[PDB]
Design a protein around this ligand. Structure first.
Ligand SMILES: [Ca+2]
Ligand SMILES: [Ca+2]
Ligand SMILES: [Ca+2]
Ligand SMILES: [Ca+2]
Ligand SMILES: [Ca+2]
Ligand SMILES: [Ca+2]
Ligand SMILES: [Cl-]
Ligand SMILES: [Cl-]
Ligand SMILES: [Cl-]
Ligand SMILES: [Cl-]
Lengths: 262, 260, 260, 262
């Protein structure tokens, strides 16, 4: 709220892939902070359920828009809806992303192009769609959901995924310069291993095993990502641009499992 | 209770009486934190403490400390614990940046800059470690720089070396202190406007600013706001990160790549 | 038998007829390697092959290939295996760098640059993978750029995105191909003097050079020499590394930090 | 040799900590390549044994100099000996380093200052001592032995060590600019886990366990480091400066042990 540090009340936010997992975590934090939030996703049932919940969390308006981010024209439609309902857009959380696996030896052109269409083109298109509004904002913010996988780590089966997540940071490093005259910052979050509803389907033993490779000793939460996105979206983070920040409980630091202290 | 609450959190800021450190201390004081500022000059400490105590409901104290002396760091920690009941956050900010060309840099110049910039960082964290463990949500925030970890600047090879040393320390300390629920992160300031830098005059600053995509130098509060975020409960899953606060300074391939 | 021997090593270079790729191909040909150069223009391929075959005892072939087509990459690999008996090294070098401001960049411009720069990299490696496994000392060398992984340059957000994508690919491919004794590394050229760049004239080049600590643009052979090293048996424990060949271009904080 | 790619014949090299382990690996590669090599170390018995072996490997002159690199004046004496015997210095391999352990909670001022004196001051002093000769060379080369530990990874017990190894890279990033007008390049090697005589004292089982955390499936060798140092020292590597390159068999890449393919 006004007079508080890190005020986001009445700030207008678009979150792609905002109905589940990390995206819902970002949308939730913004909603609690009093922001107007447009959540985009592919399933109208998931969108409506998310909107119903989030609208109750704070004084901002929350809307849902079915959007395939891989289609520039649908990204334009999403930006248009947010401008019509909120009067503007101050923050775009280009979060939509998928992570199917494909060994390099078998990965097909369809698999390669498909993951790029969502993860990279959807990032570009979301930003371009919102750019006019972000300019008009005067304190615009672009927050990309990248990953430790690609920019920092590797993981067999995800060479395409990592390529997309690094691509987002290459985009960032230029977009931060290109958009600086408009007072728009462009930053990224690299989540490590975050507990989601999907991951819980695998059961408690699988998660505990993953947690043993993390210095923090536990997986993070979707709100861990949302809280950083919220910080980056504040007026107080205005001199931060072009940064990729890992939210990973130290996952990338140990030289091997033997380097983990408990 | 609010998002990003720091009310009643207890903070130690080394080199906290001037410049970036004063910016850090100020943001914490406004957030309702208890703040212990350390510095070398008792006149600057007393002036700083007088201004900060007025900003919020927290207790502010000032402690004359040479951070290059482990014993003096221990004494600073002791004072903070005695006066606040604990320490939740250490901002190891103290640092100096004299120049020395590589060709002429003396052993005395090399050792001196390391004693403050690097030994002062280890010692401030070590001194506060027992309290940070007792906290249950402890936080170490290091003030590094873009110079060293990212960029170079002739005359500052020793300084850059100290700034990068802090991040090397960080990457192990983050692992080593994780079992205690202490996060360890670093801020890499770019070009930040300070009182010291204004002595050079407005034309010098404007020239510097033309090399920054943001088109202006940052402020000490820019650094303090990031330190304050890292210090929140909400930042508990972020550790071992070095984060530049530089208006995009390190991004352009050359002056030619800056848009305006 | 000598240190850094490449005699009879079999190399595929995509985009090998011009610029940096021709530099790569040239260094390998001089080292006695068999070299397959791929390109889009049959006139450039035939001219390139004529010159390279004269440089060493290795066989040189030229193959017209659109690397954005997986099938054409498979055909290039097939030709190299048929003519050389195997493939020890793939230099996935092919790449384009048209500009497009972010504000106006079309889907066609975005997709096009990715098809060449990124899909062409995956496909060239995949096409050669069976041969690289059969090699026993296989090598993948990617031509990335400072732009994307390190720097930004307005008009090239898509290009930078492709260049960084290559390194994301690398970091997994290095792990995934390690059991096969295949290393995967990347070169990040800075500003390299090419025939294309000389069309702009000597004043433009001199201006660019003043922003580089080395004080000159690099050469295609600078890139080729690093690729050749990575391709040696002696470089077998180096994998997943991206190495800039840029005369220090990315280091200075600003033009003001350059010494002369 | 002349007319060969990567000629180092008659190039003049100073290697600090050059009598054992990685240093001896660097010195050996240079000796095989026909370089003049001055090896420095602390133990006259180790120096003389190393010099005897290396002098046989090629046509260059090899000398040994007892040097405590933490003392600037002894670094000057070392540079002086190399200039007197070889006529000049083209390459300094600032390799000397120690890696004692100290938990952060107990690390003393003596431990902290001691490791910095060798690992950092010895790097600065070796370069400064050789700088006049490197200038006179016209194709001078500084090669620092850093580590993955500090610049990239962490390892409990080695926070001071990692701080020293990162310090070397901060020095590099400025020295590369500062020395560029003299045509001196300044690069670093970050070894991962390298098999040395010291490490073999721990036995085969310990090493095999370490190897399982490495994508390459084995520890590297001192000559792996030496071959890269040799490459960086060539005329052909003249446009490479300010780079830190890991020689680690992929050790830093996996997100965890679960990400290792075999
Ligand atoms: Ca509401
Ligand atoms: Ca107060
Ligand atoms: Ca001065
Ligand atoms: Ca031939
Ligand atoms: Ca154009
Ligand atoms: Ca000899
Ligand atoms: Cl990246
Ligand atoms: Cl660092
Ligand atoms: Cl990258
Ligand atoms: Cl570093």
């Amino acid at each position: 709220g006004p007079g508080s540090m890190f005020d986001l009340q009445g700030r207008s936010v678009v979150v792609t892939g905002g109905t589940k997992g990390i995206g819902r975590g970002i949308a939730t934090v913004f909603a609690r902070a009093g922001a107007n939030v447009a959540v985009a996703g592919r399933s109208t049932a998931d969108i409506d359920a998310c909107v119903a919940d989030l609208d109750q969390l704070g004084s901002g308006k929350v809307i849902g828009v079915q959007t395939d981010v891989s289609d520039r024209a649908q990204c334009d439609a999403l930006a248009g809806r947010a401008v019509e309902e909120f009067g503007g857009i101050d923050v775009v959380c280009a979060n939509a992303g998928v992570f199917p696996d494909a060994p390099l030896a078998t990965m097909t052109p369809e698999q390669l192009n498909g993951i790029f269409a969502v993860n990279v083109n959807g990032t570009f298109y979301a930003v371009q769609a919102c750019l006019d509004a972000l300019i008009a904002s005067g304190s615009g913010r672009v927050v990309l959901t990248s990953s430790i996988t690609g920019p920092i780590t590797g993981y067999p089966g995800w060479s395409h995924y990592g390529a997309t997540k690094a691509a987002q940071l290459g985009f960032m490093r230029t977009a931060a310069i290109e958009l600086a005259p408009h007072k728009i910052t462009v930053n990224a979050i690299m989540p490590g291993n975050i507990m989601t509803e999907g991951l819980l389907e695998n059961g408690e033993e699988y998660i505990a095993s993953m947690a043993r490779s993390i210095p923090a000793g536990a997986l993070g939460t979707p709100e861990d990502i949302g809280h950083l996105a919220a910080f980056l979206a504040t007026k107080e983070a205005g001199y931060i641009t072009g940064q990729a920040i890992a939210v990973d409980g130290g996952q990338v630091l140990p030289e091997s499992l033997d380097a983990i202290a408990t």
